[PDB]
């Protein structure tokens, strides 16, 4: 869960590599975008919008192993100064309407950098952010330019737990390199169920193990020799995904000027053709 | 969306400006 | 990135350009 | 506006001096093109903290595509550097190969036209990154 | 973000075309080499 | 908003080309 | 038909020679040095043989015009000073030679600030009493910030002069 | 007046024939124009240090007057002159430029593109930070691969084995000081060997 | 009288030429950069963060299959590790697939060595799997000084293979 | 070989009435190339920045082979130039090579000492020496004795304030980019205004 | 060697080509003494830069001498600042001044001569910086 | 003394300024000057003579006042590496005779900064040291090169006591701004003999002074206002004078190569006007 | 330093050189 | 010593002139 | 210390002339017409 | 001392084969 990350890795949420610290338990990878304007003047409120895609259909083995619904989280690194405009700055449906749930600062202070604990279900394949620029005229410590914003996108549950033990969604392979005579896939009671095995590979070592609820089994007696692999099934359908872009603070001074010089250039450029070229009626005499 | 709904904008303007300079100066 | 395709087509465009207007230039003031 | 003295080979017919006098209105609009981009879309920064943190794309410029997606495609060796030095020392031979012709022109010769068409698109193709739609896809 | 690019390239190409218009449109109405 | 004009302007000003094209005339 | 006439192009050339400079202005500022206040001369107060001219550092040290230097004014010196009462004083003579440009020397026995250089001897106030040296030593405040014995751009009318400093 | 009489006038002259794409010369060399200009522009603030040289980048952008500006276009106009000489490189292939005596003017041409990228491969590493760090770091021992000397190649390049302290200062003059000199040289014989004529027609 | 015989400066710009090799040596010699001799790094102290580090500091928390950088040999980065019983780790490899240039990945999964920019894959001690994995990734020795760990300039033979080293 | 074969025969121009002295103008030239290369090659291992600009003087002095060597010659060179473009003054002078039909030549060259002096000025700086800090130190103000101008001069040269490293940043873009252009330009323009002569009879 | 039809202002008598091969002479020439006084007068290392301290020596390199003992002779001012600028602007107008004798060469012309050695001495004079007081001397 | 340098500023003997420790104290000054070859080869005992010049005749005050003769001292720093060379190394009158006093380091270990402690009198105007040159090639810590050598030469007493009190060797001005009316110099008794004096400035404060032994009086009396300025004489008759220098540790090796080239040049060049011009008969026949 | 007389003096042979040499070269090619 | 020869070898090797001085 | 340019000044001056000598010198045991 | 006991040497020497090298091939 999103609040993992912040618990484990807490003074940043991407490694030195740039890879987003959710990778080391959600393995699979799955697609991941954000959309944020080219550009947005300073202190305007924009859009942003984390698109964690994935067709509502097929289920997950939950923790009971029985299929279940997805669920969706991430983390946006949105650049120095920006964070969420205050609920009062937010549009009508513009900001408001689209996507409502709660955006928790990675730490105290950083409020542009949120974690999306909320998990959402189908709903939120979207997921839009209302966040406000920030204004380097109020704040001297800001300046107008390009800067980078970074996302880490996931969905389905994750292979390992905080608590450094994986979890029932993934293949769980076998301990010893042989073959299995059967399946002890028995239930549980109450709370519980798991869904044991009993390995062979007498070889000397004559070995069984533990595969949880959940996954599915494929082979078992009379061959699954391999060497301690593929359980029989990997349950993992979603996963990871990770997108970066940028978005430029501008300044609409910056802008005039530039569109003011090209007038210029355009009207000088328009007296060069007209004089020059056109006037060439001297010699155009004899 | 403006690209035209304001390009074709812009264009047109110096643009009338250079037909016209035109013929201010072709009489 | 986003000059990512400014030069990819505006390469096309030119490509087009001489490739297209060209074999066909001199294709006719010295063709028939 | 072409007649007969120092009369033969290749020269000047039309327009003399004042093209030079549009020029510059080529030059203000490079200047200008280049102008509104530089706003509408300036450049940015990085890091200096750690240079153990290896990122993991690796974007050099555009055009160190098709030359890169080379050099990381056939195995290392020299073939890929070998391959590479074809570019440029391939190219300062064609006006050797390409170099027949005279009367004519020069868009009547298909062993080239076709040849250099192929060759921008493998060019094209090869510009391609990072696992990008890979060597293959296409 | 490959629509970024997408949308970027296609603007030089047509432009281009948007551009020359003008320009064969501008030469019409003052005399254009029609031989 | 004041950004659509910017590009409106980059792509508006590549008129700097639509000058040459128009270049061409006679001597 | 009667042209004759490209007496007009005083336009052409004028308008361009305006997108000319209109380009030429910002790249000009460019090269043109920005604002500034400290980097250096900023806030530690700096020394001679490894410490820090302060208050609280240099208030009970001196005594008879002690002579150590804290940093500088937009690249100057500095100090804490003291002369006839036993307490630092309150003034800054800044230590720039006024005739070539070299960090002068300060002599508590001829009280004068002999600077090697071309021979200029100020008093141990800034008085130059005789030459080849145009005006005396330049100057600055004499307080705090706290803890660091803090001054800042001069602008105060000098005092050896009465009227306005030989600076403002 | 005319005291200028170090043999002067009847210098308007020369004709033209028919072309449209014969700017993309002149293109890409305006374009180098506003690279030597913004690029000399940042030798005054730019401190190539493997400590300082980031950080002087970021003065160019907040701290120095339109220094955002000057390093933009820079950026652009590299990747733009690159991009008009390819161009340049298509107007002349598909019109036969390197015509039956102009062979010479297109091998100093090739030579010109080498020179050309091997400037943005300088420049782009010299801020220093990642993707600029990383990719000459990456690039450093490509030529390591050619024997004989293909080691030596790659020790001169950077200077040392690895890349730090000294890629950054050998890549420094070569961007600035190296590479702008053989340009120049190469832009100036491609320019002189051009007492020739060019196309077809009728 | 019969002279025609310029057939003699095959020598005047014979010992001319020479002239010029002559200065042209040591100008070569002068653009190949200085080597090591006794072959040693001289440290600014790096991390993988990029602040100041400490033994006991990284060199505490290695648990089953800890790797992370810090300020390394000559080009090749440094990884600190320890074993199981947490004993000096004899081996610090230097992340250095010399394939095309990336910083060979430990595995947080395998405990090997799987390269990600271009599939090199490696094992607990540094042990490539296959390919495009070049060889086997080059180990360290195990030990500490004064907060400040000690690990040395290699040019030495591993036992990972038995022969003479590689990797020096 | 023809391909713009058409010029060559344009070889072996000219002779010479009376010489000798008239050696003066190659040899400060060739002071120049020995400066050009000399400096050059050490832009591959100096460093300017205060902080490292002394310590890779020394450098290069014990480590790099031949460093006191390529060094030594630059700081010998240097002072032979100016010393040899007197001397050339002097030939030139007392001959009355300035006369009528060459003025230009002798005024781009009273340019071309400017810019001659001033390399020595920003170059004697670099080593961050006493000698060489303080001798810029002292310079820096010499202009400010003007208005408005005479200090906007000033802060353009320094860096602003007094001598920050900012100083040192433009005084090595000054000796190492902009100063070696400006002799290119006009040792360019002095060279070619010369199809010249004088002093001579029947 | 010289006839009658190339008439002017400038001339080429005798000696071609080939005194452009004594030139590699003089070159060889040149760089062996700046070679031979680099070897034997090793470039000396001097002493880091401190802010602080200053005086005890200073001087500008050397060709600033005469140029340096007027800055620091005159008050100050701008008389110094507009006096040295006199050096090369003076000298830009010389083939101004001195260039009455087109008809005959300035070089016997004393009033040049004499003011070309005087104003040599001056310099020479200035040059030696000179212990301020007695700076006097001649 | 020397010693007394090295006790008050035990860590350099010179400012970061340049200027020698002594000026502190012999306010005085008066020439000096350091004579070494241009270059010695490496481990070379040679010369190094600091020359102390002041004709002998003329006598200072000494502690009592009475006229006495001079005595010399110095501080010399050699470049890193050389010290003095080793009692059996000096040859015979060649280094041995010239010159026979202690050398004493500055501080433990610098032997290439040497204080001439003894204090020499008429004899030693001239003090010559024979140093042993450096081996950059028996120590990686010592280079070729040239490397810069200073003086500090000093003679007559200092105006100025390490216990912060003035010598009776320079002036001791008034105390007050007035004119005096009297010599209040009489002697003492015993072990001294001070001259007081009877200042009067009576102008409301009325004060005098104590002036020691040694110093001449000039005016008193009747007038002499000025401002507490001076006493009435200054038999200050000594000083210090510093001078520097650089030597070239030359490595015989970089010369014969330089010779070898040379060669090589000047040989290249007899071809040339050889070959050259002189075989100039082709058309030298037409 | 010295060098101070390298061409304190390598320029006054030069002037000799050419004031000497000089007024009296072409003080004779068409002297009298 | 060895040093003599050095400076005979730059008042030696002016002889670079002594050849044009064949004029 | 003048003393080590007053001689280094001399040698430069003469020098010239033992050069020229043996310029004219050798002219001369070849033929200076 | 050895300029002359010397350089009349070294001098001479270049010189001798100066002086020869030309009657051999004068030959
Ligand atoms: C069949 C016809 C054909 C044609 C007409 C072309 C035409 C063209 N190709 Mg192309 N190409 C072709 C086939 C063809 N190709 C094939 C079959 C391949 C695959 C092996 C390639 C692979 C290829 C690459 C990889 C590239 C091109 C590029 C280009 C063009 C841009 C020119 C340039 O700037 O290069 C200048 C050269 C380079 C960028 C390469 C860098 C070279 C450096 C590293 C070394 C130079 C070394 C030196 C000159 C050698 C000295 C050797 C010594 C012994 C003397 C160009 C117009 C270049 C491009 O599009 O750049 C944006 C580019 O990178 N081509
Ligand atoms: C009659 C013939 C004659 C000739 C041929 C010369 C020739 C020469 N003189 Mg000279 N001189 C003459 C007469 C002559 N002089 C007379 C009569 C006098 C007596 C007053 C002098 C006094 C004199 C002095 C005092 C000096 C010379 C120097 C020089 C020479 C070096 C030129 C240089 O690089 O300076 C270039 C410039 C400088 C050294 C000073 C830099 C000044 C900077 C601050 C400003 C430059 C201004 C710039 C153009 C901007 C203008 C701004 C505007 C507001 C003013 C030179 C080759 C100089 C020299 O020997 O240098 C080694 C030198 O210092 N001469
Ligand atoms: C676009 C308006 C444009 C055209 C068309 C064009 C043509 C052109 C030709 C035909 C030449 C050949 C010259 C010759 O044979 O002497 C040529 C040469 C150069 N150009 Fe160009 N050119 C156009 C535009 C531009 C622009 C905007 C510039 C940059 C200022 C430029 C530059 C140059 C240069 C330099 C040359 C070499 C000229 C020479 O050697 O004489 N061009 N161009
Ligand atoms: C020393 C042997 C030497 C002499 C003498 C000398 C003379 C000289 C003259 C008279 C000219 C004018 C030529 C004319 O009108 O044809 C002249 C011109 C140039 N020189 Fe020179 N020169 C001597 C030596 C050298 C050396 C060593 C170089 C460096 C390669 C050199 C260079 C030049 C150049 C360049 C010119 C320009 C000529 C032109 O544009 O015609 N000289 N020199
Ligand atoms: S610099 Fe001190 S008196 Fe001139
Ligand atoms: S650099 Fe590691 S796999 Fe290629």
Partial sequence: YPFWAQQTYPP?????????????????????????????????????VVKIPY????????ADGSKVGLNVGAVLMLPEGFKIAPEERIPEELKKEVGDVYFQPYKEGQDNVLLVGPLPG??????????????????????????????????????????????????????????????????????????????????????????????????????????????????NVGGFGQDDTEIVLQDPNRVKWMIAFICLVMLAQLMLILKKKQVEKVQAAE | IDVLGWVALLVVFTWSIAMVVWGRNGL | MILGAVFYIVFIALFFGIAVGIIFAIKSIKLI | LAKGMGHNYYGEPAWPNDLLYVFPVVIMGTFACIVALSVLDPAMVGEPANPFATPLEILPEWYLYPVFQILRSLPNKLLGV???????????????????????????????????????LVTIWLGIGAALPLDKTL | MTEEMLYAALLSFGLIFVGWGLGVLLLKIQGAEKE | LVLGLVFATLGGLFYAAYQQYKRPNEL | ??????????????????????????????????????????????????????????????????????????????YIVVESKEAI?????????????????????????????????????????????PLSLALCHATVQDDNIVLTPWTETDFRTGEKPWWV | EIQALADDVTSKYVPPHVNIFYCLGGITLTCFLIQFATGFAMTFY??????????????????????????????????????????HVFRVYLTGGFKKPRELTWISGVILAVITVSFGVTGYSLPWDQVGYWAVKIVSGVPEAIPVVGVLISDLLRGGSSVGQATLTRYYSAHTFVLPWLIAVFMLLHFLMIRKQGISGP
């Fill in chain 1, 122 to 235: 189908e709903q939120y394949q979207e997921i839009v952010f209302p966040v406000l620029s920030p204004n380097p005229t109020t704040d001297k410590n800001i300046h107008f330019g390009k800067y980078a914003i970074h996302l880490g996108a996931n969905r389905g549950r994750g292979q390992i737990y905080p608590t450094g033990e994986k979890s029932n969604n993934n293949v769980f392979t076998a301990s010893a390199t042989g073959t299995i005579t059967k399946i002890a896939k028995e239930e549980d009671e109450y709370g519980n169920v798991k869904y044991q095995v009993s390995i062979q590979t007498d070889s000397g070592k004559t070995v069984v193990d533990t595969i949880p609820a959940g996954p599915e089994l494929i082979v078992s007696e009379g061959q699954a020799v391999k060497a301690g692999e593929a359980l029989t099934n990997n349950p």
């Fill in chain 8, 46 to 87: 730019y401190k190539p240090t493997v400590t300082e040289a980031y950080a002087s980048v970021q003065y160019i952008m907040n701290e120095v007057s339109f220094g955002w500006l000057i390093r933009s276009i820079h950026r652009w106009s590299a990747s733009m002159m690159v991009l008009m000489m390819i161009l």
């Fill in chain 1, 12 to 48: 940043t949420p991407r490694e030195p590599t740039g890879r987003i610290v959710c990778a080391n338990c959600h393995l699979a990878a799955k697609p991941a975008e954000v959309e944020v304007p080219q550009s947005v003047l300073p202190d305007t409120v924009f859009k942003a």
């Fill in chain 4, 82 to 120: 070998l391959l590479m030095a074809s570019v440029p020392l391939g190219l300062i031979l064609v006006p050797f190969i390409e170099n027949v012709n005279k009367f004519q022109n020069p868009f009547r010769r298909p062993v080239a036209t076709t040849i250099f068409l192929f060759g921008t």
């Fill in chain 7, 89 to 133: 004083r309150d003034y800054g003579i800044n230590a720039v030679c006024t005739h070539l440009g070299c960090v002068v020397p300060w002599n508590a026995a001829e009280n004068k600030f002999k600077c090697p250089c071309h021979g200029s001897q100020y008093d141990e106030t800034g008085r130059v009493i005789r030459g080849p040296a």
């Fill in chain 1, 55 to 62: 067709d509502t259909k097929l289920q997950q083995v939950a």
């Fill in chain 7, 1 to 78: 038909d009667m042209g004759r006439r490209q007496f007009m192009n005083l336009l052409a050339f004028g308008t361009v020679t305006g997108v000319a400079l209109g380009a030429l202005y910002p790249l000009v500022k460019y090269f043109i040095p920005p604002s500034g206040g400290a980097v250096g001369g900023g806030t530690t107060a700096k020394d001679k043989l490894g410490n820090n001219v302060k208050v609280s550092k240099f208030l009970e040290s001196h005594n008879a015009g002690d002579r150590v230097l804290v940093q500088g004014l937009k690249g100057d010196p500095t």
